[PDB]
Amino acid sequence: DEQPEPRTRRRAYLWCKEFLPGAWRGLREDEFHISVIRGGLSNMLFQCSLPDTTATLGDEPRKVLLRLYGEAMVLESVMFAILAERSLGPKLYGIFPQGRLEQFIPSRRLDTEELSLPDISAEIAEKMATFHGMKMPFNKEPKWLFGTMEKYLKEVLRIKFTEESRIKKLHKLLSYNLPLELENLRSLLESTPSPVVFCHNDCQEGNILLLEGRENSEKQKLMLIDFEYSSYNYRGFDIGNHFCEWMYDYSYEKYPFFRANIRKYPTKKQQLHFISSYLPAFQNDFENLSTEEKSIIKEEMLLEVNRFALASHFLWGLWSIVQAKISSIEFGYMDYAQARFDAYFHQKRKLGV
Amino acid sequence: DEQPEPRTRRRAYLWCKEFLPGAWRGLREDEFHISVIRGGLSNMLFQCSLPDTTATLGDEPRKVLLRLYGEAMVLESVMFAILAERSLGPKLYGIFPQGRLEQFIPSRRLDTEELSLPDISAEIAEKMATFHGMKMPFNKEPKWLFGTMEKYLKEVLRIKFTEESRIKKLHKLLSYNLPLELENLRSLLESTPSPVVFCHNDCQEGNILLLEGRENSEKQKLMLIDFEYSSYNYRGFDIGNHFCEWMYDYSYEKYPFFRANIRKYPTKKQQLHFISSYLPAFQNDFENLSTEEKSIIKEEMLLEVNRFALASHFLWGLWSIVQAKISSIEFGYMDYAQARFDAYFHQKRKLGV
Numbered sequence: 041d042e043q044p045e046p047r048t049r050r051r052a053y054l055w056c057k058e059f060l061p062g063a064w065r066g067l068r069e070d071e072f073h074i075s076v077i078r079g080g081l082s083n084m085l086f087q088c089s090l091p092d093t094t095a096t097l098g099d100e101p102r103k104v105l106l107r108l109y110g111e112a113m114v115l116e117s118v119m120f121a122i123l124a125e126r127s128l129g130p131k132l133y134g135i136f137p138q139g140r141l142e143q144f145i146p147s148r149r150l151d152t153e154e155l156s157l158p159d160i161s162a163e164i165a166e167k168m169a170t171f172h173g174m175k176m177p178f179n180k181e182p183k184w185l186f187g188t189m190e191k192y193l194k195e196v197l198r199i200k201f202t203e204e205s206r207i208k209k210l211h212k213l214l215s216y217n218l219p220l221e222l223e224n225l226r227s228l229l230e231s232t233p234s235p236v237v238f239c240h241n242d243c244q245e246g247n248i249l250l251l252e253g254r255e256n257s258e259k260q261k262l263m264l265i266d267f268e269y270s271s272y273n274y275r276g277f278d279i280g281n282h283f284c285e286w287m288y289d290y291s292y293e294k295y296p297f298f299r300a301n302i303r304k305y306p307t308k309k310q311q312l313h314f315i316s317s318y319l320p321a322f323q324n325d326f327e328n329l330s331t332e333e334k335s336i337i338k339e340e341m342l343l344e345v346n347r348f349a350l351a352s353h354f355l356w357g358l359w360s361i362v363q364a365k366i367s368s369i370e371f372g373y374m375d376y377a378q379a380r381f382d383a384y385f386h387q388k389r390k391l392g393v
Numbered sequence: 394d395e396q397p398e399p400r401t402r403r404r405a406y407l408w409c410k411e412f413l414p415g416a417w418r419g420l421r422e423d424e425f426h427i428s429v430i431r432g433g434l435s436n437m438l439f440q441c442s443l444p445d446t447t448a449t450l451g452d453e454p455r456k457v458l459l460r461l462y463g464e465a466m467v468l469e470s471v472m473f474a475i476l477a478e479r480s481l482g483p484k485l486y487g488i489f490p491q492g493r494l495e496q497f498i499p500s501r502r503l504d505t506e507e508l509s510l511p512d513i514s515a516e517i518a519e520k521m522a523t524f525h526g527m528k529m530p531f532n533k534e535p536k537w538l539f540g541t542m543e544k545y546l547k548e549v550l551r552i553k554f555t556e557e558s559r560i561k562k563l564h565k566l567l568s569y570n571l572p573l574e575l576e577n578l579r580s581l582l583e584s585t586p587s588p589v590v591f592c593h594n595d596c597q598e599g600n601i602l603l604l605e606g607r608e609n610s611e612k613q614k615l616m617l618i619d620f621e622y623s624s625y626n627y628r629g630f631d632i633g634n635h636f637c638e639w640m641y642d643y644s645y646e647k648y649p650f651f652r653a654n655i656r657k658y659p660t661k662k663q664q665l666h667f668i669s670s671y672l673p674a675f676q677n678d679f680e681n682l683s684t685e686e687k688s689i690i691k692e693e694m695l696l697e698v699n700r701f702a703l704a705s706h707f708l709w710g711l712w713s714i715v716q717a718k719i720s721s722i723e724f725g726y727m728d729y730a731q732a733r734f735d736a737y738f739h740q741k742r743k744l745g746v
């Protein structure tokens with residue numbers, strides 16, 4: 041049990057005491073329990089709980105998660121509150137300028153290897169389809185994807201690195217002519233139909249909870265979390281981006297702190313399994329269509345998601361170059377950027393585009 | 394049909410086109426309809442609609458309300474979104490830095506005289522009880538009431554008026570010794586039990602919709618709106634404050650632009666009718682209690698709400714003095730302050746406290 045700094049213990053006690061009902065309201069400071077889940081400079085996480093010897097008075101939680109930040113603020117808070125109301129995310133117990141109190145969900149995150157398990161993959165698809173089907177009070181013009189890529193590309197072309205290895209690696213990445221490549225990708229995707237839906241935009245193992253005590257259950261053992269990058273976007277991006285994440289393991293404990301394997305991208309068989317679960321969850325009379333109409337829809341979706349996978353590589357590659365310059369957290373960002381652009385051209389070669 | 398300024402028409406068209414689905418997404422500027430509901434400097438309201446000749450494609454609204462503002466921002470937006478999810482307020486279609494798009498609810502506001510109609514009063518009580526019963530992710534310590542009164546009192550004692558009539562009226566209002574009176578009220582209310590619940594804090598005719606087409610229905614013909622001043626607070630304040638509003642008509646078309654009548658405060662008979670509807674809506678097996686246990690609960694509530702009514706007068710009286718100094722909107726603020734403090738001492742005399 042890693043203990044927080046004294047100032048954080050006191051602040052956490054006050055937020056719990058004032059925002060949570062029942063036994064919390066009368067809790068003494070010397071009875072308050074708190075431990076660090078993740079520290080750092082931003083998005084710090086703590087578990088806060090009542091003493092085992094304190095009974096609950098009503099329906100109040102015995103344990104909660106405190107998230108510290110360390111208008112995007114408004115949109116994020118409204119999104120979280122709405123997903124909570126709809127039973128699609130952890131409940132929201134308290135909101136304040138410095139952070140929030142959320143329902144504690146006993147669980148662990150998935151590992152990269154688990155993404156390919158057929159039952160896990162089927163559930164991710166069903167969960168993503170459920171999120172895609174819902175209405176949210178946000179801008180419905182799908183400007184996010186190329187808007188973000190253009191903004192990031194402009195930043196990348198203004199970066200002045202001082203460190204030798206980053207200078208060299210940047211020269212190589214820019215040698216591809218990224219403006220031209222971006223507008224060729226824009227052209228390709230302009231001609232690729234894909235419905236605009238509420239997308240997670242970051243569906244990978246770190247953002248998927250395996251619910252404790254349900255590990256052996258057939259269905260409903262996962263929860264998608266961490267929707268902070270969500271927006272209306274092309275459905276093909278959310279699915280394609282997820283598929284790309286099959287290739288990257290971020291648990292590697294030595295530099296560059298990730299492993300990449302092109303061979304771990306889902307095979308067409310595995311892609312079909314995923315979309316066969318997605319479709320009936322997104323369009324509820326889907327199974328009643330003829331085997332042949334279902335087959336055509338699946339074929340057209342395979343093309344769509346694999347083209348949109350190219351934008352996942354391009355977007356994350358640009359993001360990673362910017363991180364190499366601006367981040368305060370250690371990671372092989374330039375090497376990761378190169379891995380994404382290698383995958384981009386590999387995928388392009390395979391697609392013949 | 395009062396038309397908005399050209400800049401507002403264009404901004405409204407863009408927000409509707411980008412935030413609303415279906416036929417909105419492809420709407421041409423020359424087909425956009427908008428009219429002013431209320432103008433001003435802040436909280437401006439517009440009705441926006443599709444042409445009568447444009448069919449809806451799905452479930453999109455044909456008409457919406459645009460609210461312009463002209464962190465409190467975060468709390469207000471989360472509250473509105475949650476009440477919408479729970480079917481307790483207008484739906485939320487879009488949120489952006491300058492305002493929001495809300496469901497249009499065909500209706501009119503109630504008039505002051507309508508507050509005393511037995512069926513109307515019964516429904517207000519049931520509606521207030523429903524709001525009081527719910528959980529919200531906001532601070533549960535009831536610091537709002539006296540916190541706001543202390544803050545406002547400090548401001549009032551620093552006001553330097555230049556206009557003769559305001560100087561004279563202020564001297565009279567301060568002659569009561571407001572610090573002493575406030576702390577005597579604090580003492581009285583400290584000894585008056587009242588559960589802390591999610592309160593509207595402004596339940597009067599201007600914030601209650603009479604739903605069009607339900608005017609002749611027995612029940613469910615109202616909607617409480619405009620929760621921007623809501624907070625956890627003593628239940629007695631929300632009820633007592635509502636009762637005080639029976640006395641004030643803000644529709645008077647000459648200076649001071651309100652009428653006050655002490656005789657229009659609900660009689661004990663009328664108060665009992667209100668609380669007899671509130672109680673079974675707030676505690677759902679209430680009717681199964683003995684006639685005698687119900688009677689005692691009602692008696693104790695009558696005492697509670699009438700004591701808390703004193704804080705409604707004191708709070709609004711202070712608010713009104715501050716408005717006389719800072720407001721950009723014409724109203725008899727000093728005369729209204731005097732009316733609230735007259736009612737305060739009148740109520741004190743009747744209560745013998």
Ligand SMILES: CN(C)c1cc[n+](Cc2ccc(CCCCc3ccc(C[n+]4ccc(N(C)c5ccc(Cl)cc5)cc4)cc3)cc2)cc1
Pocket residue numbers: 188189192241242246269290355356358359369370371376
């Ligand atoms: C490298 N990569 C994908 C990883 C690496 C590692 N991990 C697990 C892990 C391992 C080690 C660390 C310590 C190093 C910190 C790296 C890091 C900090 C912050 C984020 C948040 N983030 C989410 C979505 C996002 N999008 C959707 C986006 C928006 C705009 C563009 Cl342009 C592109 C993309 C942008 C940013 C992610 C990773 C942290 C976490 C998961 C994924």
Ligand SMILES: CN(C)c1cc[n+](Cc2ccc(CCCCc3ccc(C[n+]4ccc(N(C)c5ccc(Cl)cc5)cc4)cc3)cc2)cc1
Pocket residue numbers: 541542545594595599622643708709711712722723724729
């Ligand atoms: C005078 N009175 C009650 C009225 C007068 C008139 N109307 C209808 C009406 C008629 C004419 C006008 C034009 C003049 C504008 C007066 C005005 C501007 C803004 C508000 C909003 N407001 C809501 C709750 C609130 N609380 C809960 C609060 C918080 C902190 C303290 Cl300290 C005290 C109290 C504080 C402020 C209300 C009235 C507008 C509206 C209803 C009620």
Ligand SMILES: CN(C)c1cc[n+](Cc2ccccc2)cc1
Pocket residue numbers: 202363364365366367368369370371372373
């Ligand atoms: C030029 N300076 C001070 C820095 C430049 C880049 N970083 C981020 C970083 C750190 C370790 C590995 C990868 C990226 C930190 C400081």
Ligand SMILES: CN(C)c1cc[n+](Cc2ccccc2)cc1
Pocket residue numbers: 555716717718719720721722723724725726
């Ligand atoms: C000293 N000055 C410029 C002002 C002082 C007070 N107000 C508000 C007001 C206006 C009309 C009636 C009541 C209150 C506006 C200007």
